[PDB]
Design a protein around this nucleic acid. Sequence first.
DNA 1: CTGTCTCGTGCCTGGTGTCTTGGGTGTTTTCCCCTTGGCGGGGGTCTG
Length: 50
Amino acid sequence: FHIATIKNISMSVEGDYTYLRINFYCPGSALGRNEGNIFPNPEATFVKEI
DNA sequence: CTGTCTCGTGCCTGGTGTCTTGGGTGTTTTCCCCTTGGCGGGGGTCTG
């Protein structure tokens, strides 16, 4: 995935395990100065979180 | 009939709130430094 696809990332430690979340851009989540970045096909499936 | 104000969504975007960073400024924290901690023979002098 290109770094542009990723919207942000977060990391958490739970003593026994560590969780790393990665959020991409998608319709509805393109908040802020990225609104003008209209996706080429907003009707497709967007992977929003991993 | 009738249409203008209102409730109730979608949509989105722009405006709210706050991490993050830098500077000013007082305060502890170590190290360094200064002050401190047996025997005898004489002599003379004073009191009675």
